[PDB]
């Protein structure tokens, strides 16, 4: 009840009870700021739990052994963990830690790692080294959380104190059990109580910036810090998603069993496919009904043209024909003592026989119940376990099938009986078609591809300088300036004047290490190659790009669920056309010099021979190299620059790679390691992986398959499908589509035999295909069943964050950004919208205050950041959806939605002004907004959230020689420099400063210098300046909004009739969205999902496909469109395009094209800084932008909404102005008609032009 | 003229939308499970 007493107004504010104001928000934020952890645990103890919330806790979590019997010292004086269960028992042991703690000062009941053991390990003791390695590794495991966990627990308590929430659409309260039924939260309380014991302190551990402190007690172990985060994640997911209690109890049982085992991370890795394999892989054993989408994707295939044609009922014969997954599931449940959970899951799964919403929600809950944490282990062990495996080639290429060496490459004669002939042919044709194809010789293309890898990020520069100084060649050093000295930009500046002959030695340097953790998967090591080593591998990635662009059917999709090929999964998961999931295990170590690289280098080498003689490639001169090709005689065979590139890359690939490992968690554990695995983190990795996958699948389907099969039906199936029609590969993973015939779906036995054939075929050249045939589809970690997406909640943890090194965390605005990212991730995953909004506001308030004086962010800043608001100004609660556009458009949308009530509310209490405003009328909006801090929050939200360590003082002439070095590196070909100088000349002649900052190639070194300086630690003065900036912004008073927002508010709209449905209301398209989730369900049904990949659709809008790194294509196109709208001569556009580096004829033609053509709304929108929000990109927004937003009013022309024939670009801005309002409001998306513009179309266009003449 | 956003205002659009969906000829006769005689 203390939560109620200390937070009364805040719950009523954020639960739709009363109005949502700023003073209550700030008081609640202050109370969050001053709230001790022990008080949090007391309030936790005040919870009156019930039964159904209690699950027995084994007594063996607390009583654990020590760490000495788990580690040892091998030869070469290295520290590593001995294994007890196979070769994967190399994770953190669950042993006790108490005997390694010395009490910290200023508080007795907490301690950290003792400095005595640290010193005794530093000077060379063995047991001390083991103890400190264990302590540091446990510290790293415990340090995998965004913020102190008590903040999240208290925010959940505050949010859930409100109880059930009313639903405006469903017209009833939501039936979700309260906190008294929260099993994980009760487990958290019990564990904390048992660990704390008689000691007054109750927190098992406290998480600081750098390092954490352990509360010493005999019951404390190393498995507690991940367990607590796991339970809190489960509790938050239960509260914000309506998870049923049984599945959450099963998940908590699994988590406790994992904690009680020998190793938490190892056990949770061994049991990571319990829920997905018992539930997702076993439903619909017997069907009687349901609806599935009747997708059909057109014969143009590389463009991914998908069409949706209604929904068809499910027949009984569309049951689960895949082989049963019972034996291995039962065996796994019996092995690890989880038989009860597996039996419960299997019994519960069989009770769902109809493809309604409930089964999909049950699947979503089951997949969400898995444990999502970032697994961690010592780098010297992941290096020793990942980079020592080698491929197993059972039928290698015969020795007689090669020829004499062309330098270090032997061409493979086409008379071979091996399967590598087809791979060699495909790569040879790809290389030839590249070399003949002419865009690879324009200097701009070479400059772009040379600047691809030049990035403000580490690239192992120390090894580069050591290797290059090993030949007594000296490179310049820069001292006194604040740029980072361990980045690839520094290497590029150092390698400016040097020719290729001197820098060719550094190609064989030893790469440094890298590491990053991942959810429910072993951490991946990454080797960044130095700048010349990126350079030397350009033809490989280029011909791989050609293969992946023309020869095969594949995609190179983006990171988020919005930018992905969702339609393909929906099509491949429909019942008539079942699909097969093909995955390659450990593809990094797969390809080596024995088979794959050996074929590929020769194919590339003689692919380019007869197309490019001379004409040196980027920074690599052509050279001479002999060959013993034919019988005995040897020639000199002059080669091009690309072939010298290939020779150097071939020696690098033939010898192997040297991998320096100098970790920090284990002292005295530095060494080197030679490995044969293909490097990860290189430019060419994913492209060649996908190309090889496609080529090998194609050759299997063509030649190898029929040569090793007997049955007629399987042969008929294999002759029917090809990779150009049904096979989509991206990197390691892949997906194959089997389409349905006239007689239903293809027989399962033929598919099983074909999969056995694939498994046999893959082992010939050292591949182990991980093939799953379960009736569902998996691709890029997306799960589909019967044409319905399923978001994996556990893969996106709420409190988790991966950290490899022991670096301290970023300041408070960074955690603000992280909370906003958490909210957006919750949006994409489809949670319970009301509860999720309330909890997001709770976290918002919790993390909104920080001392230095105190600094606070007024709620309105967070609203500007995109978080929707519940109930303000006395309006109806739960009135705005989260499809609100972020940014200015978003403010306009909600303000224009609620304006006629805002004015009434303002006037009703002491805000009256005689002056009349066209937007707000006679209400003193200025004083009200200044008092409400709305201006203050709106302006403060725009300030940068990172210290302005860029621009720090630097001694002169040193920055000058630095910038000169980058300028020389960027532009080695004189003709491109001539183009840039011309572009500047006609820009001075014609541009005349119409646009303030036109992008150009000369400013790339400045941007690179700023970026390289940015990646550095910020001094205390930079943080002080940041806090002073925030304080000054808060204290200041603002007269009015930004120009864009004031211009937007001049537009009025009207909403008459709702759209007709675009999707059947009985068709489950995605999990989590259903009648229980009113807003997303209605939004998707009224608008419709996007049935086209967003990547290509967004790509077709850009004028220029790609530009040099350090410049933005959006910036270039925005400058071009500003120079069109603000009247300017064509010559100005020609000068701008020349400054970008385009050739004079092409620049002239493109400027002439741009002058007169019209372009779709997206590009025109960019002119005023507007883009489609990342939230909308999961829906079919294009049709709404085209048709369902009409600029002509419903009652004809009003003579006031008269857009002139000039400035016709206003239509796109009006389209987003209407669409933001159409999408912000809850319920059905409604057709929206333009009503009135106050100042007139020409006046509003003049306002936009006078803003364009800025920036 | 000055139309705000209201719960009843959302409800009327919801009713119009659902009526428009229900008045679809295919939806009017579509069924997910067969009756006792269509199976025969």
């Amino acid at each position: 009840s203390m939560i109620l007493t200390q937070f009364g107004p805040f719950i009523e504010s954020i639960s739709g009870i009363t109005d949502q104001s700023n003073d209550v928000f700030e008081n609640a934020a202050k109370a969050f700021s001053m709230f001790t952890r022990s008080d949090v645990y007391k309030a936790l103890d005040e919870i009156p739990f019930s039964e159904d919330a209690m699950l027995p806790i084994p007594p063996t979590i607390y009583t654990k052994p020590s760490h000495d019997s788990y580690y040892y010292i091998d030869a070469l004086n290295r520290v590593r963990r001995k294994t007890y269960q196979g070769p994967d028992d190399v994770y953190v042991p669950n042993c006790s830690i108490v005997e390694l703690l010395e009490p910290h000062e200023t508080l007795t009941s907490y301690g950290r790692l003792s400095e005595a053991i640290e010193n005794r390990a530093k000077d060379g003791d063995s047991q001390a080294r083991i103890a400190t390695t264990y302590g540091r590794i446990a510290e790293s495991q415990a340090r995998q959380i965004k913020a102190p966990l008590e903040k999240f627990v208290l925010a959940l308590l505050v949010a859930e104190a409100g109880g059930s929430l009313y639903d405006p659409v469903l017209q009833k309260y939501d039936e979700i059990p309260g906190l008294s039924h929260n099993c994980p939260l009760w487990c958290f309380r019990e564990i904390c109580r048992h660990i704390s014991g008689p000691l007054p302190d109750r927190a098992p551990y406290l998480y600081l910036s750098a390092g954490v402190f352990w509360l010493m007690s005999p019951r404390m172990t190393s498995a507690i810090p991940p367990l607590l985060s796991d339970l809190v994640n489960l509790a938050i997911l239960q509260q914000t998603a309506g998870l049923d209690p049984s599945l959450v109890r099963l998940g908590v049982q699994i988590c406790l069993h994992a904690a009680a085992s020998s190793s938490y991370a190892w056990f949770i890795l061994k049991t990571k496919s319990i829920f997905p394999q018992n539930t997702l892989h076993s439903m619909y054993e017997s069907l009687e009904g349901g609806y599935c989408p009747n997708l059909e994707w057109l014969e143009p295939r590389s463009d991914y043209k998908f069409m949706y044609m209604g929904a068809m009922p499910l027949s009984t014969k569309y049951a689960r024909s895949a082989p049963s997954n019972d034996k291995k599931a039962r065996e796994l449940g019996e092995k690890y003592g989880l038989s009860s959970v597996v039996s419960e899951l299997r019994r519960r799964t069989k009770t769902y026989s109809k493809h309604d919403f409930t089964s999909v929600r049950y699947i979503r809950d089951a997949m969400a119940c898995t444990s999502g944490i970032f697994l961690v282990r010592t780098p010297t062990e992941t290096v020793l376990q990942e980079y020592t495996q080698s491929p197993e080639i059972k039928v290698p290429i015969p020795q007689k099938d090669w020829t004499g060496p062309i330098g270090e490459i032997r061409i493979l004669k086409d008379t071979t009986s091996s399967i590598a002939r087809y791979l060699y042919r495909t790569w040879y044709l790809a290389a030839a078609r590249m070399a003949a194809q002419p865009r690879t010789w324009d200097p701009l293309f070479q400059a772009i591809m040379r600047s691809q890898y030049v990035t403000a990020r580490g690239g192992s520069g120390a090894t580069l300088r050591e290797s290059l100084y090993a030949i007594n060649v000296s490179l310049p050093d820069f001292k006194g300036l604040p740029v980072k000295a361990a980045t690839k930009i520094f290497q590029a500046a150092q390698l400016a004047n040097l020719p290729f002959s001197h820098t060719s030695v550094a190609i064989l340097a030893d790469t440094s290490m890298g590491l990053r953790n991942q959810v429910q998967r072993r951490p991946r090591s990454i080797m960044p190659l130095n700048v010349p080593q990126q350079q030397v591998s350009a033809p490989h990635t280029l011909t791989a790009d050609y293969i992946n662009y023309h020869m095969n059917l594949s995609t190179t999709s983006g990171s988020a669920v919005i930018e992905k090929v969702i339609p393909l999964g929906v099509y491949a998961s429909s019942p008539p056309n079942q699909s097969i999931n093909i995955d390659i295990s450990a593809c990094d170590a797969s390809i080596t010099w024995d088979f794959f690289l050996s074929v590929i280098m020769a194919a590339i080498h003689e692919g380019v021979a007869s197309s490019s003689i001379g004409k040196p490639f980027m920074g690599v001169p052509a050279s001479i190299v002999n060959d013993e090709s034919v019988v005995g005689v040897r020639a000199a065979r002059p080669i091009s620059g690309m072939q010298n590139m290939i020779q150097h890359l071939s020696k690098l690939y033939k010898r192997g790679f040297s991998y320096r490992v100098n970790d920090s968690f284990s002292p005295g554990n530095d060494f080197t390691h030679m490995t044969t695995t293909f490097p990860s983190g290189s430019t060419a990795t994913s492209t060649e992986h996908t190309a090889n996958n496609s080529t090998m699948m194609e050759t299997f389907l063509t030649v190898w398959g029929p040569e090793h099969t007997d049955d007629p039906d399987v042969l008929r199936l294999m002759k029917s499908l090809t990779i150009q029609r049904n096979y989509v590969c991206q990197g390691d993973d892949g997906l194959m589509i089997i389409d349905g015939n006239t007689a239903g779906k293809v027989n399962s036995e033929t598919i099983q035999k074909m999969l056995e054939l694939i498994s046999k075929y893959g082992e010939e050249f050292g591949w182990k295909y991980d093939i799953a045939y379960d009736g569902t589809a998996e691709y890029l970690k997306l799960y589909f069943i019967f044409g319905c997406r399923i978001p994996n909640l556990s893969r996106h943890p709420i409190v988790g964050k991966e950290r490899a090194n022991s670096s301290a965390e970023e300041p408070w605005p960074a955690i603000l950004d992280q909370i906003m990212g958490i909210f957006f991730n919750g949006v994409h995953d489809g949670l319970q919208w009301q509860r999720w909004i309330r909890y997001s506001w709770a976290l918002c308030c919790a993390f909104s205050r920080q001392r230095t004086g105190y600094l606070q962010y007024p709620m309105w800043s967070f609203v500007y950041w995109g978080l929707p608001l519940v109930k303000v100004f006395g309006s109806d609660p739960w009135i705005f959806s989260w499809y609100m556009p972020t940014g200015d458009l978003g403010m306009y949308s909600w303000i224009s939605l609620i304006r006629p009530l805002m004015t009434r509310w303002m006037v009703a209490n002491g805000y009256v002004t005689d002056k009349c405003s066209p937007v707000f009328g006679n209400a003193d909006y200025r004083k009200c907004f200044n008092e409400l801090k709305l201006y203050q929050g709106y302006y403060m939200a725009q300030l940068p959230r990172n210290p302005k360590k860029s621009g720090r003082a630097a001694p002169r002439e040193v920055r000058e020689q630095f910038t000169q070095a980058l300028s020389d590196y960027l532009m080695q070909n004189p003709e491109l420099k001539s183009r840039v100088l011309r572009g500047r000349s006609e820009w001075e002649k014609y541009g005349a400063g119409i646009i303030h900052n036109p992008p150009s190639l000369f400013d790339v070194p400045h941007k690179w210098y700023q970026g390289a300086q940015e990646a550095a630690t910020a001094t205390r003065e930079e943080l002080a300046e940041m806090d002073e900036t925030l304080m000054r912004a808060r204290k200041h008073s603002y007269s009015s909004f930004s120009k864009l927002l004031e211009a937007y508010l001049l537009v009025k709209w009207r909403m008459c009739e709702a759209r007709e449905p675009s999707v059947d209301l009985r068709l489950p398209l995605c999990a989590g969205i259903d009648p229980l989730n009113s807003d997303p369900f209605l939004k998707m049904v009224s608008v419709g999902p996007m049935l086209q990949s967003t990547r290509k659709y967004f790509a077709q809008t850009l004028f220029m496909a790609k530009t040099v790194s350090g410049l933005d294509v959006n910036a270039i196109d925005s400058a071009l469109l500003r120079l069109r709208t603000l009247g300017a001569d064509k010559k100005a556009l020609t000068a701008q395009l020349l400054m970008v580096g385009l050739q004079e004829s092409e620049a002239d033609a493109l400027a002439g094209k741009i002058m007169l053509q019209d372009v779709n709304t997206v590009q025109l929108a960019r002119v005023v800084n507007l883009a489609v929000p990342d939230t909308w990109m999961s829906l079919d927004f294009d049709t709404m932008f085209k048709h369902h937003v009409k600029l002509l009013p419903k009652d004809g022309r009003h003579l006031n909404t008269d857009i002139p024939p000039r400035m016709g670009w206003l239509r796109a801005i009006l389209r987003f102005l209407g669409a933001g309002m159409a999408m912000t409001a809850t319920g059905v998306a409604v057709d929206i008609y333009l009503e009135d513009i106050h100042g007139g179309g020409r006046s509003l266009g003049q306002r936009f032009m006078t803003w364009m003449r800025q920036e | 003229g000055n139309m705000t956003l209201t719960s009843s205002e959302i409800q009327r659009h919801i009713t119009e939308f659902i009526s428009s969906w229900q008045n679809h000829p295919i939806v009017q006769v579509s069924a997910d499970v067969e009756n006792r005689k269509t199976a025969q």
Partner: peptide, 14 residues
């Protein structure tokens, strides 16, 4: 209105 939404001379006289 919200609750409704929830629920959903002498001579002349002579």
């Amino acid at each position: 209105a919200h609750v409704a939404s929830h629920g959903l001379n002498r001579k002349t006289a002579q």
